[PDB]
Amino acid sequence: ENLYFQGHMIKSIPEWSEQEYLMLSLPHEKSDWNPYLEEILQSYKEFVKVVSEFQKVLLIAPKQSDFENFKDIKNVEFFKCDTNDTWIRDFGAIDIVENGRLKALDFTFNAWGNKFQSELDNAVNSKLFKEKFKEELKKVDFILEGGSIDFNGEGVMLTSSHCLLNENRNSHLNKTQIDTKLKEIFGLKQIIWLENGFIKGDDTDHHIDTLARFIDKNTIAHCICEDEEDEHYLPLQKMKEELKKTGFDLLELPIPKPLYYEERRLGATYANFVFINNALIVPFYKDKNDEIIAKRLSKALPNHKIIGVDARVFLRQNGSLHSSCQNRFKGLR
C-alpha cells in the first residue's frame, strides 16, 4: 500500500523483523532496584547472555562500574548515560520505516502519569542518538510508552483504552483525536482498542504488553485466567471475547497461580515476551504454566527457538522482560 501523507510513506515494524540491537537500561544503586540490586542484576546477566547468542546487546548505565558485571559476554556493547529507571520499553526510541529508510521516533515519557521521576529517562534517546548512533532523531510532541502499543506489520496496531485514554496521559485530546494521530504517525489502517483486561500489580494503567501480543501477522497471543475465583477471570474473559471479534487467530497464555512478595501480588504475565533474531525469549515464573505456554508458542512459531528466562525478580518493580528492553531494527538508515 503506497500511501503518502504530508511528504512521507510510513510502515510500522513488527518485533519479529530483523534486528541490529536489543537495548537495556541496567539497574543501579540510585534506582528503585536498590533493596535487591544483586538479585535483579543476576537475572539481567542471564537475560543478556541468552540474547547475546542471537544478536548484539546494548547496555545503558550511569557508571562504568555497572558494566563490569557483564564484561566477558560476546556481542555486548556499553553506553554511559544517566537514568531514573530500567524500563526502556517505555522511554526508548521506536523505529518506523519512513520513505524506505529506518527512522527512530522520540516520544515524551512522563513515567506513567508522573508516578515516578522521568527527566533523565526522557533524555536518554537524545544523548544516545547524538553520541553513539550519530543519527537524526524525530521528536514527537506526544506522551507515549512503547509498552502500550503492539504491531502486526500490515498496518494494524493493538492497544488498551484504559492506558491511552487515561487523564494522566494525553488528557487534552479525545479518542478520535488520538486514534487519528497514531494512525498518521505509524501509517496504520486499523487500531484495535481493548476495553477490558488487566494484570494485578501492573502500575502502568493496563499496558497492552501485559495482555495481548501479535506473534505473526495473523495470530494474537493473549492472557486468560483458569481460576474462576481469581479477580482476573471475567476481565480477561471479556477481553477474550473482544479479541474473537477481530478475526485474528488466538493463542492462550494462562496466567500463573498468584505469587507474592511482601504480601503483595506480583503482576506475572506471559505476554511480556520479546522477539529477537531467530528466538522468542519468554518470561518464566516457575509455575507449571511455563512449560505449557512455551510449548504452545513454540509450536506456533516453527522458525524460532523459544527460550524460557526466569523473570520473577523483575515483577517486584511491576514489569517483566519485554518491559526491560527495546528493539532496534536492521536496515538502511
Contacting positions for K ion (CB under 5 A): 106, 109, 122, 125
Q: Which one, 122 or 237, has the nearer CB to K ion? A: 122
Block residue for cell numbers 497461580: 257
Q: What residues numbered 3-32 form the site for ligand N=C(N)NCCCCN, per CB under 6 A?
A: 32
3 three-class SS: coil
Q: Which one, 125 or 170, has the nearer CB to K ion? A: 125
The type of residue at 203 is D
Q: How far is CA 132 from CA 81, 251, 332, in A?
A: 11, 39, 17
State how far the Cα of 89 lies from the Cα of 138, in Å rounded to an integer: 17
Q: Which one, 116 or 129, has the nearer CB to ligand N=C(N)NCCCCN? A: 116
Q: Which of 213, 225, 201, 209 is nearest to 315 (CA)?
A: 201
State how far the Cα of 216 lies from the Cα of 306, in Å rounded to an integer: 14
What is the grid cell recorded at 218?
495473523
Among 152, 317, 326, 327, binds ligand N=C(N)NCCCCN (CB under 6 A): 317
The region of 2-10, 100-108, 181-189, 314-322 touching ligand N=C(N)NCCCCN under the rule CB under 6 A is 314-322
Q: Which of 151, 148, 207, 189 is nearest to 13 (CA)?
A: 151
Q: How many CB atoms lie within 10 A of CB 221?
A: 23
Residue 89: contacted member of K ion, ligand N=C(N)NCCCCN, none (CB under 5 to 8 Å, by partner type): ligand N=C(N)NCCCCN
Q: How many CB atoms lie within 10 A of CB 195?
A: 10
Q: Binding to ligand N=C(N)NCCCCN by residue 147, rule CB under 6 A?
A: yes
Q: How far is CA 102 from CA 80, 90, 185, in A?
A: 24, 20, 14
35 three-class SS: helix
Among 12, 160, 204, 327, binds ligand N=C(N)NCCCCN (CB under 6 A): 204
Q: Are 209 and 150 in contact (CB under 8 A)?
A: yes
Q: Which one, 47 or 133, has the nearer CB to ligand N=C(N)NCCCCN? A: 47
* Residues in a beta bridge with 150: 158
The region of 59-67, 102-110, 253-261, 317-325 touching ligand N=C(N)NCCCCN under the rule CB under 6 A is 317-325
Cβ at position 127, least distance to ligand N=C(N)NCCCCN in Å? 21
Residue 122: contacted member of K ion, ligand N=C(N)NCCCCN, none (CB under 5 to 8 Å, by partner type): K ion
Residue 140: HSE in the Cβ half-sphere, 13 Å Cα cutoff = 21
**What binding mask, one character per residue, do residues 83-112 give for ligand N=C(N)NCCCCN by CB under 6 A, x or -?**
----x-xx----------------------
* Residues in a beta bridge with 260: 265
Residue 319: contacted member of ligand N=C(N)NCCCCN, K ion, none (CB under 5 to 8 Å, by partner type): ligand N=C(N)NCCCCN
Among 31, 83, 84, 318, binds ligand N=C(N)NCCCCN (CB under 6 A): 318
Among 27, 146, 187, 319, binds ligand N=C(N)NCCCCN (CB under 6 A): 319
State how far the Cα of 154 lies from the Cα of 19, in Å rounded to an integer: 18
| Residues at the interface with ligand N=C(N)NCCCCN (CB under 6 A) | 32, 87, 89-90, 116, 147, 203-204, 207, 317-319, 323
